[PDB]
Design an enzyme around this catalytic site. Structure first.
Site, mmCIF file in Angstrom:
data_model
loop_
_atom_site.group_PDB
_atom_site.id
_atom_site.type_symbol
_atom_site.label_atom_id
_atom_site.label_comp_id
_atom_site.label_asym_id
_atom_site.label_seq_id
_atom_site.Cartn_x
_atom_site.Cartn_y
_atom_site.Cartn_z
ATOM 1 N N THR A 82 -28.453 -47.899 113.546
ATOM 2 C CA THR A 82 -28.603 -46.743 114.435
ATOM 3 C C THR A 82 -30.050 -46.279 114.568
ATOM 4 O OG1 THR A 82 -26.399 -45.771 113.783
ATOM 5 C CG2 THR A 82 -28.058 -44.233 114.764
ATOM 6 N N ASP A 104 -30.885 -38.126 109.615
ATOM 7 C CA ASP A 104 -29.438 -38.303 109.592
ATOM 8 C C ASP A 104 -29.103 -37.950 108.156
ATOM 9 O OD1 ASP A 104 -27.115 -40.912 110.951
ATOM 10 O OD2 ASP A 104 -26.964 -38.734 110.837
ATOM 11 N N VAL A 109 -25.177 -19.084 92.659
ATOM 12 C CA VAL A 109 -25.699 -20.376 93.061
ATOM 13 C C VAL A 109 -25.868 -20.373 94.568
ATOM 14 C CG1 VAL A 109 -23.427 -21.171 92.853
ATOM 15 C CG2 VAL A 109 -25.165 -22.767 93.307
ATOM 16 N N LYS A 118 -26.952 -42.188 123.007
ATOM 17 C CA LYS A 118 -26.695 -43.627 123.032
ATOM 18 C C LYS A 118 -25.267 -43.949 123.451
ATOM 19 C CE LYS A 118 -25.090 -47.666 120.902
ATOM 20 N NZ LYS A 118 -23.675 -47.994 120.463
ATOM 21 N N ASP A 178 -18.849 -26.175 95.069
ATOM 22 C CA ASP A 178 -20.120 -25.635 95.532
ATOM 23 C C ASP A 178 -20.843 -26.744 96.299
ATOM 24 O OD1 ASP A 178 -19.966 -23.006 94.420
ATOM 25 O OD2 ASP A 178 -20.128 -23.956 92.450
ATOM 26 N N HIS A 179 -21.293 -26.445 97.505
ATOM 27 C CA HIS A 179 -21.937 -27.450 98.344
ATOM 28 C C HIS A 179 -23.402 -27.158 98.531
ATOM 29 C CE1 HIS A 179 -21.804 -29.572 102.571
ATOM 30 N NE2 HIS A 179 -22.409 -30.306 101.658
#
Ligand SMILES: CP(=O)(O)OC[C@H]1O[C@@H](n2cnc3c(N)ncnc32)[C@H](O)[C@@H]1O
Ligand SMILES: CP(=O)(O)OC[C@H]1O[C@@H](n2cnc3c(N)ncnc32)[C@H](O)[C@@H]1O
Ligand SMILES: CP(=O)(O)OC[C@H]1O[C@@H](n2cnc3c(N)ncnc32)[C@H](O)[C@@H]1O
Ligand SMILES: CP(=O)(O)OC[C@H]1O[C@@H](n2cnc3c(N)ncnc32)[C@H](O)[C@@H]1O
Ligand SMILES: CP(=O)(O)OC[C@H]1O[C@@H](n2cnc3c(N)ncnc32)[C@H](O)[C@@H]1O
Ligand SMILES: CP(=O)(O)OC[C@H]1O[C@@H](n2cnc3c(N)ncnc32)[C@H](O)[C@@H]1O
Lengths: 297, 299, 297, 299, 297, 299
Positions: free
Chosen positions: B215, B207, B295, B190, B141-142
């Site tokens: 960066t 990010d 979920v 960049k 699960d992410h």
């Protein structure tokens, strides 16, 4: 088509081996990024080659284990024909059985095979049955012969081989058979079991870690009237107060092999280190060319 | 149930302690020491036979040590007959090594190692690449972390804002936040240059990870140099290695927003800074996962 | 000992490759029974050979996938030494992540390995990390260089590379670097991000499926004052109204490769197709003989 | 339980709808579309986390398309954390490719694919070869279909009947039916010849599958040509490809009996014909399997 | 680099094969300790060789199966390049399907692959689909041609091939096609199906175990007016009262092959045994050198 | 529960019957015959669909026959949909072949075979080598048997005792018993010699297995020859092959203590002898394992 690589564990041992066989350590980078992750970058095509990786999973075990695995992965993904591992020192080999714990020596085997190893070459595993934790071929070089020969050569009088503990008895026998000597053990629960008066005693274990067990053994021997005392082991783990403890012990001399790279910052006093490079070097070739490896025992 | 045993290894215990307290459980008792040797020792002083064990561990610096203890733990549990061994990884180390030449794909090797060790499933937060999710064959699960940061900024009540992608890969993430805040996007091409209108705007740099802070600081300064009202920066994973802190404390960043997925360096403090907790989220995730309540509702 | 076979996906591409390398497409039958089942019958002994199979899993994906798998099975069972797959177009590669769905690009990898593949050769996967869905070796040829060269050669003035969407930015950069040009993207949520007035814009994606995304992009560009507009992609999926939509678009010209076999019944008007046969042909050899494949980038 | 989620893919929805209604459940809600692209799309609009999912699908024409969607479904479910993914296959396509030279054994490849995808178990009906059952290593229950046809004919009250095996492989099946009806058997030794007494008898031809209807029509006509009172034909799986229908409608077959394991061609109708349903059987099979009540009781 | 070994099942068959091909049976010990455990000790280096093991898993099946597996394990662990199994008789092949039972023919396949086999060579499996229980290559030699030839040579008049049971019909057809004869079966539920009056009938099954089925068949034939009766099968299991029953039957003659080693203590009277050594010997070579094995059918 | 089905194969039925009675269950009904052929036949006349099956079997003489039936049983059960297939092995044959040159490691091959067949977990008693435990990847609980023998001797009330290790590998085991009885240890350094004081003492010889009884009898006699008050001998596994019995009946061993892990030879009886049962232990082990109550508590 044979390529040999050295990771970070024991490079001095690795070059010695490479020279004996006759090749240049591979062009590879085992670097690190700012955080703490390893960046392996193989600086040359090994497509179709037979790659041998030399690495002891000595302190720090987890770091060395991981770079080894990552290297394997790099090689496998890069199309090596065979990825063969040479492990002078198999870390976690003492954790070979169970009250509610892991069996790391087995987890490792499983990791190494998953990563992609083709075969393994090892030296004196803490338990000879660890050999069975693998399903890929594994050759087990033994290290006692080496020490036996150095002791045999010493010409000491009425010697007795001593097993510092209840698990060492087999190993002690192997060495007792070489020097044609009797055996005695330290029944530490601490007591001596066997005649040892006025004798030159040789203490032997596979690993000398904290040097706790062994120093205490040597002193007890002396305390029980032993002519003099020597101590040997294959793997010089010497962690913690190990060196200080030995330098202060009664050990006339400590004999070890270079399977594990010695602490650069602290030196044992009365001491001798034998190399295992000649042995492994010979196994590489014999395995690479498929000649009887059993011939070396 | 009483079969929800939760363990914390060494990576981020404060976070673990929190997710356990929130859930309402005592952290499983487990010796997780290292021998002087350096090898890792494990005793699990509490029968877990038949239990559902959850292990909490970020594979943050040092990655290899944390990875190894995690694996050894799993092994211990599997060998000790746990019913399920479920892994909660607030921070998935090596997610940057996600493709190749003659290089390894460590994010994949890891997956393979974890499954070999014996994991039953995985719970993760903002992987560097969403497709790493497919490197596994056990359920995973992410959890997304953007919603959390979105919400902080939303209640900040700013005006005239633009979301900025520090690089060519961040554009998706930047979009997710631009949406959640109904703002426009601009990126730092960049190769260093700005692409998009940003004059007099309140820019937010985002990010997934802020590692060396190289960066991003350079990005913030360029923004200012191009006439931006003020500048904020956020990321989920505060890796802050090397000169990161010093570089940010000196940057033009009005404030840096991060989560506690990675345990903060105890010896160096960012100045203008805010850390949001992800404990409530994972705690929630564990519960839903354990009782089998949807979920996806998070994500 | 090298044999190459072509299944039904893109035979024209397959013969072109075979000719470049220098062999005859294998003697094999990929037939069909009255019902709808495929009957593979290998018309020659390939015992001990290194077989290369060429197949794009393009429309219809499921049929092509199945024959590929069945072929592999036939070869494995027939004792091929290696079964190597060359996939000019990896179908299902867009389904590489998850709200309650499968990850077909991964299921496929797993199917292919189960069937018996030894290795894979691919061209521009939708996601470079799909490469990690496999555990068998996989070489990833990239296709941008080809298009870059055709554009570089065009000598157009003040050009800008454009990413039709939020995921294309990397690819756009790769091409922007070749032609030494700036980049701009279509922030479609629809809006332009970056200077593009009076410029020759090149739109680029990995795949042009329904041509929906892209045509709408080109028109917006024009609508925002762009000197002229070109569009390119590697994989010409062109399903649905794709052709009609492009023929009506403002696209001065559409550049594609022959990774996917073109619809015989409908023709794009202003159009150019580059071949990828030379590239794959070279990879076959280099893989077959074990020469640096990385050398081609 | 409420954890009995059942899904139907595209092969035989009428049969699926029936087995679900019989069981007493609503077919799990699931987008099972194909993109214009032709690739198969899947959304399962209903958390199935922790449920026991049953998928109903015959791998009938087109076999490769049905196989692929089945596999993709399984993948979706596995990745979505189903507890068990159980497959109900009324018709196992490729069962004819069950051995080799230089040919594949697709019935085996399939098994291997299905297990790889993630199946937990399989339920099947009259496989072409009973030993295909052994191509799997996950549990598989094999339902026989002869009893059903036996019973139809039994209530037909015919007299002087002989069971006929169209070919050398059908002899076992013919025996099963001959027994269930206490009749003698005869076979068509087509190399074409009759082996056994059949004069003035009511002959019943039986095969597991009637594909092109080539074998069987030619058989019926030969029977008639050898003086048989009248002729009936039955099989479980109505593949009827090619000229099958036309050939039968023109044959001497008084009537053709088949089951609904395969969805009938909507555009062409057999004339003298009877279709028995296998829904009650599978429905029953699912129930027994799900609650773990003996199913051998069917077989 | 080809080595052939014989375990205990059918050594006479194994030497015959070895001689035909042209090598010496390997130097290996398949011993036994006081208890009942087998102690395999390979008396020579086979590192890198292609080892062929010959063994029928005939009575006692479990003992033969275990030594076979242990041998494989020894070879794998000893680094053989390939471990190829030649099984003249596949025991447990009748247990190929299911009311609440195992599928031993499949368990075996799985065991053999786990142990470490590279490929298999078999002769007349009870069920041709057992071939699919494996995922490693397997070549299936058929044995009917041999018997056909011996019968063809006999010049008997108006012969009929008979299938003792409902599963034999295919096999019966294969033989009926050779001798260009008609077929009839024993519908034992016991009855004859087909014309057989005054005919020379040949009964054929793959295995003749207890000889129950078949003797009873032969007598029924006679009882139904058959000129004379012959019986053949590939695998002579002949357990129990088999011999006595046949010696007393009406069978003019029984034809079998030497796939299974004949009971030394009891002899059939009217009998003929054909060798399958020439066939397997040829397959070894053809497999070892990679020549069309399909060529032999 | 009623899902605790227990089966006994042919190795040690008396022990099995006992562990079942103790537990309080009827031994699952199962045809476990061999065809005349010698091949093993199996019918499990009792639906076990969804049950938790425990199989009791020592792989004692003949090892290969017992191993094979065990494997075939497992296969039957797996194919028949058992929920768990748990193996109880009182005596693990081939544990002596635990390492290599050009020899196999049968203890490992076995593990691999058992897992392939389909085992879920294993319960064992005194393996020749404790690390064999690691040859598996499925859970395995290892019961020690020394406590049992320790206790018999303890209640014997002897005085002036010394524990003796017949060989170089027994020293650990000897220690375990020496501890449990607070006695000193001595070993037979047979290369044959005594190492340690043993004059006028009551010596107890102990090994894990007494096979040919060669090693041990010769040991006892040497002890006597070196002036030991009296001599006892014990081991867990009574293999007693060959001349074992005759050799012991003639030895100086006052008494031999063994357990019923291996079924005693019906045709030859030791004279001075005592057999302790391990049924209570395994019965207990099964119960704890089945309901998931700590079992480490034994060990
Ligand atoms: C002395 P032994 O008979 O070899 O017992 C091995 C034990 O030492 C412990 N051990 C494992 N890893 C070790 C390490 N690095 N430090 C100290 N001892 C170790 C383990 O708990 C193991 O059970
Ligand atoms: C981060 P990107 O710009 O999306 O592309 C990924 C690159 O980061 C590199 N990389 C992997 N691990 C890294 C780390 N810990 N630090 C920095 N870069 C790393 C890889 O070599 C790869 O080329
Ligand atoms: C535009 P992206 O960032 O590449 O997102 C990929 C999405 O496109 C969808 N997709 C996958 N297969 C596709 C197909 N054949 N048709 C259209 N889009 C596809 C999937 O739902 C997937 O989540
Ligand atoms: C059907 P049989 O007569 O029992 O023997 C099986 C044969 O059918 C063939 N076959 C496999 N798939 C087929 C299909 N769909 N249609 C017809 N025959 C097929 C195989 O090649 C095999 O030779
Ligand atoms: C006659 P068939 O159609 O080959 O049926 C095979 C049956 O014979 C039985 N069988 C398996 N092993 C056998 C053996 N060694 N003894 C007798 N018959 C066997 C099995 O029960 C199997 O179902
Ligand atoms: C028993 P040890 O003295 O601890 O060392 C093990 C040795 O016993 C041997 N062995 C294995 N199986 C045996 C058995 N059944 N009988 C006797 N020794 C055996 C092995 O060859 C190995 O050399």
């Amino acid at each position: 088509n044979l390529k040999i690589f050295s990771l970070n564990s024991n490079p001095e041992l690795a070059k010695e081996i490479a020279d004996i066989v006759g090749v240049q350590l591979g062009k590879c980078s085992v670097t690190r990024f700012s955080d703490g992750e390893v960046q392996i970058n193989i600086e040359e095509s090994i497509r179709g080659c037979d790659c041998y990786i030399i690495q002891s999973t000595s302190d720090p075990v987890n770091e060395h284990i991981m770079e080894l695995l990552i290297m394997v992965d790099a090689l496998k993904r890069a199309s090596a024909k065979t990825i063969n591992i040479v492990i002078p020192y198999y870390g976690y080999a003492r954790q070979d059985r169970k009250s509610r714990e892991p069996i790391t020596a087995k987890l490792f085997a499983n990791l190494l095979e998953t990563a992609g190893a083709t075969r393994v070459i090892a030296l004196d595993l803490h338990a000879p049955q660890i050999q069975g934790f693998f399903d890929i071929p594994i050759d087990h070089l033994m290290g006692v012969p080496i020490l036996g020969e150095y002791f045999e050569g010493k010409n000491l009088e009425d010697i007795v081989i001593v097993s510092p503990d209840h698990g060492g008895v087999t190993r002690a026998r192997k060495l007792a058979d070489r020097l044609k000597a009797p055996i005695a053990i330290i029944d530490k629960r601490m007591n001596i079991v066997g005649n040892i008066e006025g004798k030159t005693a040789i203490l032997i274990d596979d690993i000398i870690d904290t040097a706790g067990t062994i120093t205490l053994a040597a002193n007890a021997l002396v305390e029980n009237g032993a002519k003099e005392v020597y101590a040997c082991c294959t793997h010089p783990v010497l962690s913690g107060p190990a060196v200080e403890r030995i330098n202060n012990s009664t050990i006339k001399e400590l004999v070890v092999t270079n399977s594990i790279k010695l602490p650069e910052e602290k030196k044992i006093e009365r001491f001798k280190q034998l190399s295992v490079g000649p042995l492994l070097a010979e196994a590489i070739i014999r395995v690479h060319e498929q000649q009887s490896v059993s011939y070396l025992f």
